[PDB]
Amino acid sequence: STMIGRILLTVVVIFRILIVAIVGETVYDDEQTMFVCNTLQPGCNQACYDRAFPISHIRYWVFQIIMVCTPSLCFITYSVHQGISRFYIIQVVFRNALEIGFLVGQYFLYGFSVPGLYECNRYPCIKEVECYVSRPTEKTVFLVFMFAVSGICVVLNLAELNHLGW
Amino acid sequence: STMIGRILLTVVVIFRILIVAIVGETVYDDEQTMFVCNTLQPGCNQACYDRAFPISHIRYWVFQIIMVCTPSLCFITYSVHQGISRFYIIQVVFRNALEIGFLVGQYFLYGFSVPGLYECNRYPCIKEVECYVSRPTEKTVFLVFMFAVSGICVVLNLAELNHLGW
Amino acid sequence: STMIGRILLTVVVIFRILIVAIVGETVYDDEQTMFVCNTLQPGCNQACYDRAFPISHIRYWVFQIIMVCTPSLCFITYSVHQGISRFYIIQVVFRNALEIGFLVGQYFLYGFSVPGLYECNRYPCIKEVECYVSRPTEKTVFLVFMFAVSGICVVLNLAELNHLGW
Amino acid sequence: STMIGRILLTVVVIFRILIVAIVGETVYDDEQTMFVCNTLQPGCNQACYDRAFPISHIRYWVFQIIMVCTPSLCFITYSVHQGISRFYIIQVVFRNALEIGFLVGQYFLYGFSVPGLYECNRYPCIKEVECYVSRPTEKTVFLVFMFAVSGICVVLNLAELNHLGW
Amino acid sequence: STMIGRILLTVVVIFRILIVAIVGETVYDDEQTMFVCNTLQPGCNQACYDRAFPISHIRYWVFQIIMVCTPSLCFITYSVHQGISRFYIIQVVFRNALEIGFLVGQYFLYGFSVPGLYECNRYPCIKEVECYVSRPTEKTVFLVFMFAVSGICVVLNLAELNHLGW
Amino acid sequence: STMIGRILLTVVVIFRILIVAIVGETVYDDEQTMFVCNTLQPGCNQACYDRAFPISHIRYWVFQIIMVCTPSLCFITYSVHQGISRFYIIQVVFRNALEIGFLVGQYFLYGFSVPGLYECNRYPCIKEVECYVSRPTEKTVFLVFMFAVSGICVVLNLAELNHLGW
C-alpha cells in the first residue's frame, strides 16, 4: 500500500484533465443566451446572471488544475538546474493544502446542486423578478463527479503524507 | 480463435474513437436552438428540453470511451515503473464489468429510438404542452450503430475470458 | 499495366480524402437555418427537413472512407504481431464488396441530383406544403464527382482481382 | 535561363497556397447572410443566390490547387516503389494541359469583375426583382491576383517545355 | 536567496501565459452583443462602448507578454550568431523598466474594478443616457489577479538587480 | 553598428508576425454586423461599407508579410541546390523597394486615423445618408503601431545598404 497510490493518483489526475478539456468547454457555451427573465426592463438579465453565477465553474476548475501542478514544475526546474528530500516534503505539504482549500471553496461558493429557478431583486430589476436557467442537470452531474475525484485525490495524498512523514 | 480476437478488438476500438471524434460533435450542435415548443410562456422550452434530454448522448459516450481504457493506462505506468499476470486478470475483469454496465445503462436511459414529439407537463408550462425535435433519424442511426459496436466488444471480451478462465 | 494500378489507387484515395476534409464541411453548415417552408405552424420545417435529408451526404461519405480502410489496418496489426497471402486475398475480396455496396447504396438513397423544391405532407404540416432548399448546384456537383471517383476505384479493384484470380 | 525557372515556379506555387489558405476562408463567410433581395416572397433569396454564384470561387481554386499536384505525387510514389524520362515528360505535358484548362474555365465561368447588383427572374421570384451583394471589391481584387499568378505559371511551364522539346 | 529566484520567475511567467491563453479569450467574446443601452437612436451603443472600453484588457496583456520577452530573444540570437555580461545587465535593466511601465499603465487606464453602469453623453446619444455592462465580476477578479502576478515579478526583478548592482 | 542591425531586424519581424497572427484576427470579426446606417432602404449598408473599407487592413498586412519574405525563400532554394553575392545584393534591393512601396501605399489608402462617422451618397442610398462604425479606437492604435514598425525596418535596411553599397 505504498506503490499503487502513485499510479492511482497520476491516473485520476489525467482522467480529470481529459474530462475537463474534452467536454466542459461546450456545456457552458449557451449560459447567457438562453438565460431569460420575465420582464421588459433593459438590464435585468445581465444583472441577475452576474449575481447568480459570478465565477463560472469551468474556469474555477482550470485554475485549480493549474495551481495544483506548480510544485512539480518547480521540482523539474530545480532538478534541471542542478537539500533535496526537503523539497519533496515541502511540495507534498503544499499540494495537500491546495487540494483541501480548493475543495472547501468549491463547497462554499456553488454547493451540491443547480436549480432551475432564481429570484433576483437587483437594480434595475423591479422587486423580486423570476429568472430561468439552462442545462441544470448536466451541471449538477459534473459538479458531483469533480467533487468525488477531488476527494479521492485528497485521501491518497493524506495516506501518502502519513506513511512518509513523522 | 485465440489470436485474431485481439486484432478485431483493437480495430473496433479505434473505429469507434474515430467515428465519435470526427462525426458526432456537429450533429448535436443545434439541439437547443431548433427545439421549439407551442406556447408563449418564457421558461417552457428550457424545462421541457432538460426533462427530455438530461444527459446528451455524446458526452455519455466520451465518458464511456475514457473510463474503459483506464486499466491499460494503469498497466502502462506500472510497467514503466519496474505479481504481473494477476494484473492482467484483474484488469480484464474490470474491463468486462465496465463494458457491460455501460451497455445496460445505455439501454435504460435513452432506449432504441428518438421520436419527433414530446409532451411535457413541467412548471411553468400549462397542462400538457407539446414540443418538437430536430434531426431524430440520424440520432436513431447513431444509437443503433454504437449499440452494435459495444455488443461486439462484449462478445469478444467474454470469449477471451472463457478461453483463459477457470 | 500491372504495377501502376497501385499508384492510381493510392493517389485516388488520398485525392478523395483531401477533397472531403478540406471542402465538404462548410457547404453543409447552413443546411437547416436557410431551409424555409411556407407556413406559420411551429414544427413543419424540422419535419420536412428530416424527411427530405435523413442522413447528410458528408457523414455517409466519412463512414464510407473509414469502413473501407479497415482491412489495411488489420493487415498492419497482424503483421506487427508476427497463412499470409490468404490474408491478402480475403482483404481484397472484402474491399471490393464494401466499395460496391457503398456505391449502390449511394445511388439508392440520394440519387443523381438535388432539386430546389420539396413537397411535404407530414404532421403537423397541413396538407402538402412547399419547402425550399439551399445551395443545390454545389451539392449536385459534389455528388457526381464522388460517384465518378468511386467508380474508378471499383474498376481498378476489379482489374486487380481478375489479374490475380482463377 | 534554365535553372531559375524552377525556383520561381515553386515559389509562386507556395505563395499561392499560402495566400489562399490564410485569407480566402473568411472573405466568403458572410456570402449568404448578407445577400438580400427586395421582396417578401419566401424562396427568392436562395434561388437568386444559387443562380448568381453556383460554384463559389474558393472551392474552384482549392480543386485547382489539388489537381495540379497529382503528377508530382505519382512521380514521388513511383520513385519510392522502385523510364524516368518518359514519366517526367508525360507529367509535364499533363501539368501544362491542366493549368491551361483551369485558366480558361476561370475566365468562362466568373469573368473579370463582380458587380453590386443582380437581377433574377426565377421561380418563385415574381418578374425581374433586384438583389444586392456583399464585399464585391475584395473579390474582384482576389480574382485578378489569382489570374495573374496562374498566367505566370503557364508562361514558365511553356518556356520549360520549349527548352526541352523536340 | 540567490538561486530560487530563477525558478519562481520562470514559473510565474509560464503560469501567467497559460492562464491568459486558456481562459481569457471567451470571457470577452460577448462584450459588444450584450452591451445594451436605453434608447432608440441608431449609433449610441457603439459610441458608448468605444468610450467605455477603448482597449480590451486582453489585448493589453498579450502585448505586455510579448514585449517583455524580447530581450531574451535578442540574447538567444546574439548567442547563436557567435562584451557578454554587459548584455545580461542591459537586458535586465530593460526588463525591469518595461514591467514597471506596464504595471503603472494598467493602473492608469482601467483601474481596480469594473462597474455595472456607465453614463455616456457622446454624440448621437441625447443627454447622458445609461448603459449596462456584462460579466463585471469575472473581469474584476482577472484584473486583480494579473495585478498581483505583475507585482510579484517586479519584486523579484528588483531583488535580483540589487543582489548584482553597485 | 554593423552586427546588431540583423538581430533588431529579425526580432521586429517576428514581433510583427506574432502581433498580427495572435490578436488582429478578432478585432475585425464584427465589422459588418455592427456597421449600421440610418435608413430603411435594403442595400445601403452593404454599399456604404464597401465604399468605406474596400480592402480591409489585416489582409493588406498579411499580403505585405508574405510578399516581403519571398527573396529569402528564393535564396534558401538556390542555396539548397549546391554568382552568389550578386544574389544577396539583388535580394536586398528588392526587399527595400517592396517595404517602401507598401509603406507608401498604407499611407495613401487608409491614412492615420479611423473616424466614427461616414457620409455616403451611393446608390440606392437616397441623398447623403449617415453611417456609423465599430471599434474606432483600437484600429487607430493598430495602424500607428504597424506604421512605426515598418518605419524601423525601412531605416535598418537603408543603413545596411549604405554600409554595404557604392
From Swiss-Prot, chains A, B, C, D, E, F:
Look up the domain of life of the source.
Eukaryota
Gene Ontology biological process terms, A to Z: cell-cell signaling; chemical synaptic transmission; neuronal action potential; visual perception
Which residue spans traverse the membrane? 2-24, 58-80, 87-109, 142-164
Membrane topology term reads: Multi-pass membrane protein
Q: Which GO terms describe its molecular function?
A: gap junction channel activity
Q: Which residues lie on this side of the membrane: Extracellular?
A: 25-57, 110-141
Expression across tissues is:
Highly expressed in neurons.
Chain's role? One gap junction consists of a cluster of closely packed pairs of transmembrane channels, the connexons, through which materials of low MW diffuse from one cell to a neighboring cell.
State the family named in the UniProt similarity comment for this chain. Answer: Belongs to the connexin family. Delta-type subfamily.
Could you tell me what this protein is called?
Gap junction delta-2 protein
Record organism = Homo sapiens
Q: What is the lineage of its organism?
A: Eukaryota, Metazoa, Chordata, Craniata, Vertebrata
Full-length numbering of the shown residues: 19 to 277 of 321
